[PDB]
Every structure is written in C-alpha cells, then in structure tokens.
C-alpha cells in the first residue's frame, strides 16, 4: 500500500523490565565471557534482547489477535506462502480484504512499517540454574541429563525503542485501513500490563518482559518532523 509518503512518525522509547529470569539463545558459538555450551547472546558483556526476537513475538501475537477477530476483511497468511498479498481490494464497490500482520510487520511483497530496535541491559546479572531429570522408574535417580543454563536476573532495565510510520496513534486514523491501530494498541496494552513471553524456555516461566513506562513522541512531516509535535506517556495512549 502507501509507503512513499511518510505522514506520521511515531516513536516509543521506554524501559523493558524483565519480570522473570530471561534466557535468549545463540548460535552455540564460544566466547571467553561464558563457560556454558549454550549461553545467552550479548554484545560486549551486555545481555540484550535481539530486535528479531521481539519482532517475531509481536508478529505472532498480532497474528493470533487477527485470527481471533474472526472477520473476512482481515486475514493472516502463511510465511512461506507465495500466493499471499498484503491487500486484495477489488471493485465488485471499495471493499477489500487486508492482512493486519502484513500491514504492520510487512511481508515478502511489502516492507514492515514498524521498526523495532534491540534492547540492551544496564542493571543486569547473569544467573546459572542447573536442572536434572528424574527417572520415572526408581524415582530420584539422575540419568545424567544434567543441563545448566544461563539466565538474566529477575529484574533489569532494557533500552526499548520502536518506530512506527504512517500510523497515527495519539490522534488515530478515522476509518482508512483501521483495525491496525486497534491491533497495535492491543499489543501495546498487553505488553505494558501483562507483558509478552519471550526467550528460550518460555514454558517454565523463563522469560517474561514488561514495559514499565515509555514516552510516546509523535513527529509529523509537514509542520515539523525533527521537532516532536506531541509527547505523551504510553499509559495515556492506551
């Protein structure tokens, strides 16, 4: 759809406080700073959440939301499907079926309008937990499946920064390609209050990020793009 005319630039910058201990994987590579065969990824002794993982989690949550919407006007298509299009409007009228995840996070035929940066940590602390299994017969024996994993401390600030283009949030869009602003607001509300689950284990509670507070700065192209137009706290937005 329309991407060459940058109308609204929305910047969200806040702190991601890790609720429960978080573990993100890596390509099994080795470094002096770690002693575990499967450590967590970090840049120069600074554990961080890669923007790719946040993008994937957000896309999955938005896809689940869209499919739960249960409407024909908004659909979700397979990642590896070559026959999917972001929009398929036809003049039978102006009715058209759009793909909210494709609109926000892009697709093979459309770039993403939601830029998500990484998130490095400041008051981090790496904690190692050792877990072993229990043989069901002769309960208590450790069958040698003793695996120790690295984690982050339960509570540490993360530098979060996200960019959204051509999607007014403070003012919102009237009806044009709507239900995407609503989906983004729902995702932000879930992230702020509940917080999404990211990480390696993600089933034993390992990895639960949360956004405590974030200033929402809106930059509009015509009047002043460098100078922010409206700056508000994320809580008032939702």
């Amino acid at each position: 759809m329309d991407l060459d005319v940058i109308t609204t630039v929305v910047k969200i910058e806040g702190k991601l406080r890790n609720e429960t201990l978080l573990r993100v994987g890596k390509g099994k590579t080795q470094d002096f700073a770690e002693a575990t065969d499967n450590p967590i990824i970090k840049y120069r002794d600074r554990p961080l959440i890669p923007g790719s993982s946040l993008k994937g989690a957000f896309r999955s949550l938005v896809e689940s939301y869209t499919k739960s919407l249960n409407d024909s006007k908004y659909y979700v298509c397979d990642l590896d499907d070559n026959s999917c299009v972001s929009c398929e409007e036809k003049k039978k009228i102006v009715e058209g079926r759009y793909c909210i995840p494709c609109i926000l996070f892009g697709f093979k035929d459309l770039a993403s309008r939601v830029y998500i940066l990484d998130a490095i940590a400041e008051k981090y602390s790496i904690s190692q937990r050792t877990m072993v299994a229990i043989n069901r017969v002769f309960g208590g024996q450790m069958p040698g499946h003793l695996y120790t994993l690295d984690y982050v401390d339960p509570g540490s600030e993360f530098s979060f920064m996200m960019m959204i283009y051509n999607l007014n949030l403070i003012e919102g869009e009237k009806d044009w390609k709507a239900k995407s602003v609503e989906a983004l607001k729902f995702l932000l509300a879930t992230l702020v209050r509940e917080g999404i689950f990211v990480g390696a284990r993600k089933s034993v509670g390992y990895g639960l990020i949360k956004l405590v507070d974030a200033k929402v700065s809106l930059y509009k192209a015509p009047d002043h793009l460098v100078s922010p137009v409206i700056v508000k706290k994320l809580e008032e937005v939702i």
């Binding site: 759809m1 329309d2 991407l3 060459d4 035929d109 459309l110 770039a111």
Partner: protein, 251 residues
C-alpha cells in the same frame, strides 16, 4: 617555455571509465585494452581538465560559446595588424587571398568568412581556448593516458527500490564494474605557462574533482597531492630538465 607535469591523484575508493559495454545491457563493462588491460583515455583527462579550468576561470564569455556580442571589424583589423601570430592563424585558416598582409578585403568577404573571423577572434581572446585549443586554434596542452598495469576489477551490483513498497523492483538488476586504485599517474605537458593552469591545480589540491562515470554514486573522486606529484619547467634547450616537488611550484 614548456612546463612539464607528472600528476598523481590519491583517489578515494575506485573509478570507472566505460566504453562500448557490448550489447545486451546487463552489467556495465569498463573499457579494456587487450594487452595493457585497462586505461583512462587522454580525451577523458582533457575533458575533466577543461571542466575544472572552466570552473576556475568563471568567465561569462566562455559560458555562451563566446557568442554574445558583436565584434567591430575595426577591432579585428587592429588586432590583425598588431598580432603577427593571429594574422598568420587567420591567413592559414580563411585563405591568403581572402586576407591580405594589410587589410581585410571586404569585397571578397562574405557571411560565413566574417562569422569564422569573429569566432576566431572571440576564441583567441579566451584563455581556455588558448590553453586547450579549438577547431582552428593550435592547442597548447598535451595529456597522456594513465594505463595501469594493475587489473584489479571488482563488481558492485545495485538494485532499485520501489518507493510505494520497499522491495526490489524485479525489472532489472543493475551491475556496475569498478576499478579500485590508490594512485593514478598521469603525465601532462602544458605549452602555456598560464596562471589559469596553476589555479586549476590549486583547486584540485583542496576541493578536487571527479573523474569517470557514476561520479554521483561515489565512484571516482581524485585529489591532487603535493608530495608524489612533480613538475619541471623548461626554458633552455641545452640543459637536462630537472624535476622537483610540486609543492614548491604550487604553494
């Protein structure tokens, strides 16, 4: 007096001077030699130097092809009777019968001969023409090429992005060659000890101009140095020329 120069340029990244580029489009081919490999033609050097000199001079007369004003025939006759070399040039060009030793022979003159004389006057009264020559002017500057024994050629592909949707436009895959280099050596002989030439070299010292194609895309940007490059001034023909650092001549 003959001024001899051996200029060296520490160009950023590489340069590219194409030619022919076969058919079928696809990639862009930099011009070859067959034996020496690759080179920069002397004509390209002369064109770049003419552009730089025109920038330096900033002469409004040169901008309009020296065709903006009507030159009185009395002034032409005065110059002809005052300049022997100009008279010789005019006689060699328009013909001895047309232009006598003293006078213009208006009866034999016509429209095109008068236009040729006016153009010759205008161009002879222009430093750029006097240096680089013209359709009838002698010239004044000789530039050699810069054939490089090195043949390190890498390929820098490019793709166009659809503005409506940020993705590759599956219409073409632009491919551009590039000749990486660090010191381009060009020998330049100038037979006109012109302050215009010194000013042009001075401008190349600090600002520096581009050479070759796709200069708008970071391909080709030379800057003259005062350390490797050297010059030599020849006034006597009974002595071996001596080369010294270009800084003394330019600074």
């Amino acid at each position: 007096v003959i001024q001899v120069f051996r200029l060296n340029f520490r160009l950023r990244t590489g340069f590219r001077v194409g030619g022919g580029q076969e058919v079928g489009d696809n990639v862009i081919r930099q011009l070859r030699i067959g034996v020496e490999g690759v080179m920069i033609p002397a004509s390209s050097w002369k064109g770049m130097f003419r552009r730089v000199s025109e920038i330096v001079l900033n002469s409004e007369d040169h901008f309009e092809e020296h065709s903006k004003k009507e030159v009185d025939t009395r002034t032409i006759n005065a110059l002809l009777k005052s300049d022997e070399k100009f008279r010789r040039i005019a006689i060699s060009k328009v013909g001895k019968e047309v232009i006598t030793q003293n006078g213009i022979n208006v009866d034999k003159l016509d429209s095109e001969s008068l236009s040729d004389l006016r153009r010759i006057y205008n161009e002879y009264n222009c430093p750029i023409e006097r240096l680089y020559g013209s359709n009838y002017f002698a010239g004044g500057i000789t530039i050699s090429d810069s054939v490089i024994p090195n043949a390190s050629i890498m390929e820098r592909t490019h793709v166009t992005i659809e503005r409506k949707s940020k993705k590759a436009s599956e219409k073409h895959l632009f491919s551009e060659e590039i000749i990486d280099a660090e010191k381009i050596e060009v020998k330049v002989i100038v037979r006109n000890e012109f302050e215009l030439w010194k000013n042009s070299l001075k401008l190349l010292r600090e600002i520096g101009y581009f050479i070759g194609g796709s200069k708008s895309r970071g391909i080709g940007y030379i800057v003259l140095d005062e350390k490797e490059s050297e010059y030599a001034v020849i006034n006597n023909f009974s002595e071996t020329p001596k080369f010294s650092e270009l800084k003394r001549y330019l600074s």
